[PDB]
Design a binder for these strands. Structure first.
Lengths: 98, 96, 127, 79, 114, 151
RNA sequence: CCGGCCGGGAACUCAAAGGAGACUGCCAGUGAUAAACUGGAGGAAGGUGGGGAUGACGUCAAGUCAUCAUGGCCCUUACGACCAGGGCUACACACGUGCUACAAUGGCGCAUACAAAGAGAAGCGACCUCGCGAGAGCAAGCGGACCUCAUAAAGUGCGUCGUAGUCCGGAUUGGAGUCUGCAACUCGACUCCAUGAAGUCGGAAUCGCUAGUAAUCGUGGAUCAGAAUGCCACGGUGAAUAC
């Protein structure tokens, strides 16, 4: 119970952020269904590269958005309580559903 | 880059929230078909300009109305100017 | 028991899993007729079954996702050919030799900036 | 043609309308705006609608109640 | 064996007979077909009275014939005293479209004689 | 168009007949990528030609193909300002394709209400060199017999 | 009752991190023994696997002192401040790009099947009812495989206009509305009619196009007080002439 969701755009950063928390709960937890890939967002933002006519000249910009889930089933309350106040993810927010 | 233009836009967006969200609410309360009478038509003291729907919300860097972008609140040229400088996370060149 | 088959073709994949039983094909818990199968590619689904013996070897449940009809037929054919090789490679030699395992990578090309379609540009301007 | 319920009249145009009703229809009201929608009691009072540079007087009758006030002020020009 | 008043509009399809009736163009035939769904193959000449009554109901509800003529006359009069110059644009037979009026823009108006 | 090669390409046949010739006929009879109706009209035409001819359908088909068969042609080069053409025996694949397209165009030369009826009637009366495309074959033959004066 | 809820599993497309796969391997031929060009266990991928970004010094006195910092300078009760109605939607000129048209495959009704792939909180709004309609009100659940468009059209057979201005072709002016800002008047776009004019495949023609490609059907984004013939991206059915 009490799953943890992360919304990041760097595959290595999200990989390490989900590979730290899972053993943070596994210090004294157990079970855990396992890592899940989760779907991703995709948006193609185009903008006129030239400031004067010639619409054909453009460029393609995109932003990634990865998601990671752990789905712990039966952990101990100690480690899930210890999850808070130990936040180290800088510039990226974590999503938790009560 | 008209500074009187930018002053008008700044003051209208400043008055786009303090003078709004309550006059429109009053109208919506009195806009019901059940009797609406001449009160709603006689309560037209609003300039009808401070409403955000009828307000451009121009770009606030060099005052170019063209290419207004909701995602960044900028114009195309300055998006190129700043994004290429980095400092905007998550933005990489797109290909597929 | 099951036979290994996924059948990727033209954005269509069909889980061909064959069990002992009748040679009838059940598509979406339904037969081909009341599935309204007299549409395009009405006979191509039995071409792979036309040459090989039916007897009592094939009974399969199939789900197909993606594509139109040629996509569906290609998915069926690729999945059944992938499930077919349980009988050693003796069959697969002629299966390839006859083009029965043909997988074509002729997917859609992306739309290009400046051209309103895959390869059509604006009609050339005045001289 | 189009539109919905709730005919409107400008508060300033309402002031002018009251002036024409009480003081009399001496001359057509040079209505600077065109936003006002005609009420049936207007029939008999002439007003002038500003199409952008001149206030065009309106043709008032009893049978175009369901007609827009701005129509009677033509906008386009003919040689 | 009859529709509306006394006449002989027979020897044609139901939709053809409808569009042949003045007061019903092809657009009114489209409206009738959308509202009811009567088949287009049936022949008006010597058909069962039930479908005849159905077509009568389809055609009688909305404005046709003499009502159409009086409404065209009223529209012409109102266009004469409309108050908008586009009223005279339509009344003069000039194309209200505003496209090229130099030549052959009066095709819908009709004949021209010396 | 000058560096490429020819791979002798082949596309989907009709499984009932399973012939490359009938495959090419049905695949050139295709328009805008239409499969159900096109093949339906093809089979309608085949059954109607068998019914009207009375003989075996496939041998009647072969007899029709033999009837429409042309022999020779030339190519326009514009060498000396006058018709200066070397009569070249056209490729058997190209000759077959041209005969196919002449049959298809002869079918196309009408504007009849029903495509099935028009196709059946014209191909059936062209099966015995008395229909529509045989006039085109004779015209092409008349285009020959005179281009050999210059070689 | 077609509750994947159990014990769930790998043979599951799917859902993202990483490793292999192809490099002309090795033989035979044409080849100076050089590089290259012809086949075979590979063609599930063979000859840069197919597509995208990556555009060398430079020619164009080209758009940008109206985006911007000025170079030499300048308007100066400001060459500004404002409030309402008005210009880019219009219109007696030639041109171009784009859209349904020339039918019998289009308006016909019915037992009526499979789309990848997005936007979603000045937002998406499953309970009922009716509207020739735009939709009209209680409208749940929601920053997400939760709650809106998967119903895909592409078809089986009933028959039609079974030949023409035709049941094809639906460019007009006024009669009642959907959300409009305060209200639709060169002036919001959409339904119901009176409306189907000209056109029976096209002047001396040019252009784009060598395999999912030219065409034929169906979806998201920008305004969003509001609708897309188009513009930026998608899934279908798929035609050879390269001596």
């Amino acid at each position: 119970r009490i799953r943890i969701r992360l919304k990041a755009f760097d595959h290595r950063l999200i990989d390490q952020a989900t590979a730290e928390i899972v053993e943070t709960a596994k210090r004294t937890g157990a079970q855990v269904r396992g890592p899940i890939p989760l779907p991703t967002r995709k948006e193609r933002f185009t903008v006129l590269i030239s400031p004067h006519v010639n619409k054909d000249a453009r460029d393609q910009y995109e932003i990634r958005t990865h998601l990671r889930l752990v789905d712990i089933v039966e952990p101990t309350e100690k480690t899930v309580d210890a999850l808070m106040r130990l936040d180290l993810a800088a510039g990226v927010d974590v999503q938790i559903s009560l | 880059a008209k500074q009187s233009m930018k002053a008008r836009e700044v003051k209208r967006v400043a008055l786009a929230d303090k003078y709004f969200a309550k006059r429109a609410e009053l109208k919506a309360i009195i806009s019901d078909v059940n009797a609406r009478w001449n009160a709603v038509l006689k309560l037209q003291t609003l300039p009808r300009d401070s409403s955000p729907s009828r307000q451009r919300n121009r770009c606030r860097q060099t005052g170019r109305p063209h290419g207004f972008l909701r995602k960044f609140g900028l114009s195309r040229i300055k998006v190129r100017e700043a994004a290429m400088r980095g400092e905007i996370p998550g933005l990489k060149k797109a290909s597929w | 028991n099951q036979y290994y088959g996924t059948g990727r073709r033209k954005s269509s994949a069909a889980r061909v899993f064959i069990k002992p039983g009748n040679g009838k094909i059940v598509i979406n818990q339904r037969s081909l007729e009341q599935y309204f199968g007299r549409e395009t590619a009405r006979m191509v689904v039995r071409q792979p079954l036309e040459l090989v013996d039916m007897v009592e070897k094939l009974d399969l449940y199939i789900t197909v996702k993606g594509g139109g009809i040629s996509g569906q037929a290609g998915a069926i054919r690729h999945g059944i050919t992938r499930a077919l090789m349980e009988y050693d490679e003796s069959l697969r030699s002629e299966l390839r030799k006859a083009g029965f395992v043909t997988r074509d990578a002729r997917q859609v090309e992306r739309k290009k900036v400046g051209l309103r379609k895959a390869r059509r540009r604006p009609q050339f301007s005045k001289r | 043609r189009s539109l919905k319920k709730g005919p409107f009249i400008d508060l300033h145009l309402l002031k002018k309308v009251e002036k024409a009703v009480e003081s009399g229809d001496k001359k057509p009201l040079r209505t600077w705006s065109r936003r006002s929608t005609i009420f049936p009691n207007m029939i008999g009072l002439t007003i002038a609608v500003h199409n952008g540079r001149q206030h065009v007087p309106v043709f008032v009758t009893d049978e175009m109640v369901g007609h827009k006030l701005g129509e009677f002020a033509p906008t386009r020009t003919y040689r | 064996a009859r529709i509306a008043g006394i006449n002989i509009p027979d020897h044609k399809h139901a939709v053809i007979a409808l569009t042949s009736i003045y007061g019903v163009g092809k657009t009114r035939s489209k409206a009738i077909l959308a509202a009811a769904g009567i088949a287009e193959d049936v022949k008006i000449s010597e058909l069962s009275e039930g479908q005849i009554d159905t077509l009568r109901d389809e055609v009688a509800k909305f404005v046709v014939e003499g009502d159409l003529r009086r409404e065209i006359s009223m529209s012409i009069k109102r266009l004469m005293d409309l108050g908008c110059y586009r009223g005279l644009r339509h009344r003069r037979g000039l194309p209200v479209r505003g496209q090229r009026t130099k030549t052959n823009a009066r095709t819908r108006k009709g004949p021209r004689k010396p | 168009p000058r560096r490429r090669v020819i791979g002798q390409r082949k596309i989907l046949p009709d499984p009932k007949f399973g012939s490359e010739l009938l495959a090419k006929f049905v695949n050139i009879l295709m328009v805008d990528g239409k499969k159900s109706t096109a093949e339906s009209i093809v089979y309608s035409a085949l059954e109607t030609l068998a019914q009207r001819s009375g003989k075996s359908e496939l041998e009647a088909f072969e007899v029709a193909l033999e009837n429409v068969r042309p022999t020779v042609e030339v190519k326009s080069r514009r060498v000396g300002g006058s018709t200066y053409q070397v009569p070249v025996e056209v490729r058997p694949v190209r000759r077959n394709a041209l005969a196919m397209r002449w049959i298809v165009e002869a079918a196309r030369k009408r504007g009849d209400k029903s495509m099935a009826l028009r196709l059946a009637n014209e191909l059936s009366d062209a099966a015995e060199n008395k229909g529509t495309a045989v006039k085109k074959r004779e015209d092409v033959h008349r285009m020959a017999e005179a281009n050999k004066a210059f070689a």
